[PDB]
Write an enzyme that holds these catalytic residues in place. Structure first.
Site, PDB file in Angstrom:
ATOM      1  N   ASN A  37       0.937  -1.208   0.053  1.00 41.00           N
ATOM      2  CA  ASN A  37      -0.049  -0.048  -0.003  1.00 41.00           C
ATOM      3  C   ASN A  37       0.908   1.230  -0.058  1.00 41.00           C
ATOM      4  O   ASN A  37       1.892   1.321   0.831  1.00 41.00           O
ATOM      5  CB  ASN A  37      -0.924  -0.013   1.166  1.00 41.00           C
ATOM      6  CG  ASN A  37      -2.197   1.168   1.126  1.00 41.00           C
ATOM      7  OD1 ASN A  37      -2.729   1.199   0.271  1.00 41.00           O
ATOM      8  ND2 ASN A  37      -2.333   1.531   2.286  1.00 41.00           N
ATOM      9  N   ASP A 107       5.947  -4.807   2.622  1.00 44.19           N
ATOM     10  CA  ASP A 107       4.618  -4.318   3.000  1.00 44.19           C
ATOM     11  C   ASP A 107       3.385  -5.212   3.229  1.00 44.19           C
ATOM     12  O   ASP A 107       3.704  -6.367   3.671  1.00 44.19           O
ATOM     13  CB  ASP A 107       4.459  -3.021   2.374  1.00 44.19           C
ATOM     14  CG  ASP A 107       3.051  -2.166   2.983  1.00 44.19           C
ATOM     15  OD1 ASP A 107       3.691  -1.793   4.205  1.00 44.19           O
ATOM     16  OD2 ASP A 107       2.097  -2.037   2.643  1.00 44.19           O
ATOM     17  N   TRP A 108       2.312  -4.917   2.582  1.00 42.53           N
ATOM     18  CA  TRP A 108       1.231  -5.829   2.668  1.00 42.53           C
ATOM     19  C   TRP A 108       1.754  -6.964   1.404  1.00 42.53           C
ATOM     20  O   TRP A 108       1.468  -8.160   1.595  1.00 42.53           O
ATOM     21  CB  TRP A 108      -0.270  -5.388   2.308  1.00 42.53           C
ATOM     22  CG  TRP A 108      -0.638  -4.594   3.564  1.00 42.53           C
ATOM     23  CD1 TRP A 108      -0.697  -3.242   3.806  1.00 42.53           C
ATOM     24  CD2 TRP A 108      -1.316  -5.318   4.638  1.00 42.53           C
ATOM     25  NE1 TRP A 108      -1.448  -3.272   5.045  1.00 42.53           N
ATOM     26  CE2 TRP A 108      -1.724  -4.521   5.536  1.00 42.53           C
ATOM     27  CE3 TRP A 108      -1.351  -6.711   5.023  1.00 42.53           C
ATOM     28  CZ2 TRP A 108      -2.235  -4.802   6.855  1.00 42.53           C
ATOM     29  CZ3 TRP A 108      -1.865  -7.172   6.291  1.00 42.53           C
ATOM     30  CH2 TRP A 108      -2.295  -6.027   7.105  1.00 42.53           C
ATOM     31  N   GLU A 131      11.278  -4.172   4.777  1.00 46.32           N
ATOM     32  CA  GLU A 131      10.014  -3.201   5.318  1.00 46.32           C
ATOM     33  C   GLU A 131       8.689  -3.935   5.173  1.00 46.32           C
ATOM     34  O   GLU A 131       7.735  -3.648   4.647  1.00 46.32           O
ATOM     35  CB  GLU A 131      10.185  -1.735   4.479  1.00 46.32           C
ATOM     36  CG  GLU A 131      11.025  -1.082   4.923  1.00 46.32           C
ATOM     37  CD  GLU A 131      10.469  -0.595   6.375  1.00 46.32           C
ATOM     38  OE1 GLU A 131       9.619  -0.071   6.453  1.00 46.32           O
ATOM     39  OE2 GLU A 131      11.457  -0.548   7.314  1.00 46.32           O
ATOM     40  N   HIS A 271      10.410   3.945   4.303  1.00 42.06           N
ATOM     41  CA  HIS A 271       9.523   2.807   3.872  1.00 42.06           C
ATOM     42  C   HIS A 271       9.674   2.493   2.540  1.00 42.06           C
ATOM     43  O   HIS A 271       9.918   1.007   2.468  1.00 42.06           O
ATOM     44  CB  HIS A 271       8.080   3.027   4.520  1.00 42.06           C
ATOM     45  CG  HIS A 271       7.239   1.679   4.118  1.00 42.06           C
ATOM     46  ND1 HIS A 271       7.542   0.676   4.772  1.00 42.06           N
ATOM     47  CD2 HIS A 271       6.121   1.562   3.248  1.00 42.06           C
ATOM     48  CE1 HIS A 271       6.643  -0.397   4.153  1.00 42.06           C
ATOM     49  NE2 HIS A 271       5.894   0.231   3.397  1.00 42.06           N
TER      50      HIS A 271
END
Length: 301
Positions: A37, A107-108, A131, A271
């Protein structure tokens, strides 16, 4: 290099009545890059070229993101983790990946990829991650400057912040990249989310799925499961650590450092580290894949 041009071109496959978009360049066993995201396959555009010739280079756009179709109807129940996993599992089945998949996740993309790996462990040749959502978290695991905003996304303020003001795309994304982006780069990230309202729902549902302080309980259980599995899995791993980092710092970084059969590099970034240090990231992934896939193109002295 650090360029704004996308890598390859988008292909499309019919999944569950919707068209999903993905990059699929080259031949060989897959190297599967998964964004989170509020990004898309575009996140990997300067990293994927480092793997030219080493395999099928694949980067899927999650449902409702990138050039994949939006779901309709949409609302607060739409685009949860479980629904993303249903669409992504189906796309990955349709892609005929075989049994020597290298996952490259963020991330996701890591929550989705780690869970898929847990459920298909014999098919995973290696995992490169950065991350990541490596286990259930608390608010303390997020950077101090971001804790209030993430609590606001998870509150009823989230619809105005995201569906109306597009704050994940317009503030969180550039705020978690050290360097300034060009307009062309921002345009590629803005493109799936230009329209106010439900078009932006994936970027709000995602922070509402983060496994924080035990809620939502279903995602917490999923992350607990893959954390326990990864910490004992013999699969080769490449941990791309970031400084200062954002999601994988402090105790989560310490946890990731306990995982077995793992090599590590550190790159500059917060990130969305792919935008600050893509060549270092890509070179490390390429070296990892070359170790896993020894080609013996020449004599070794």
């Amino acid at each position: 290099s650090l360029g704004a041009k996308p890598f390859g071109e988008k292909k499309f496959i019919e999944i569950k009545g919707r068209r999903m978009a993905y990059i699929d360049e080259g031949t060989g066993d897959p190297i599967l890059f998964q964004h989170g995201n509020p990004t898309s396959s575009y996140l990997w555009r300067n990293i994927m070229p480092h793997c030219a010739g080493l395999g099928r280079l694949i980067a899927c756009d999650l449902i409702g993101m990138g050039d994949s179709d939006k779901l309709d109807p949409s609302g607060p129940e739409r685009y949860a983790y479980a629904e993303h996993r249903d669409y992504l599992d189906a796309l990955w089945e349709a892609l005929d990946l075989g049994d020597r998949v290298v996952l490259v996740v963020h991330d996701w993309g890591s929550a989705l990829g780690f869970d898929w790996a847990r459920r298909h462990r014999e098919r995973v040749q290696g995992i490169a991650y950065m991350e990541a959502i490596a286990m259930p978290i608390e608010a303390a695991d997020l950077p101090e400057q971001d804790r209030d905003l993430f609590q606001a996304f998870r509150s009823q303020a989230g619809e105005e912040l995201v569906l109306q003001d597009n704050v994940f795309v317009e503030q969180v994304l550039p705020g978690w990249i050290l360097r300034p982006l060009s307009e062309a780069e921002m345009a590629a990230y803005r493109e799936p989310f230009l329209a106010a309202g439900e078009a932006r729902r994936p970027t709000l549902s995602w922070p509402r799925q983060l496994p924080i302080a035990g809620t939502p309980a279903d995602v917490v259980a999923i992350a607990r499961d893959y954390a326990g599995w990864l910490s004992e899995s013999p699969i080769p791993k490449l941990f791309i650590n970031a400084e200062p980092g954002a999601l994988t710092t402090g105790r989560m970084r310490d946890f990731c450092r306990t995982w077995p059969n793992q090599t590590e590099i550190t790159v500059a970034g917060a990130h969305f580290i792919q935008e600050d240090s893509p060549d270092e990231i890509g070179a490390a992934i390429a070296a990892f894949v070359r170790r896993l896939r020894p080609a013996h193109h020449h004599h070794h002295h």
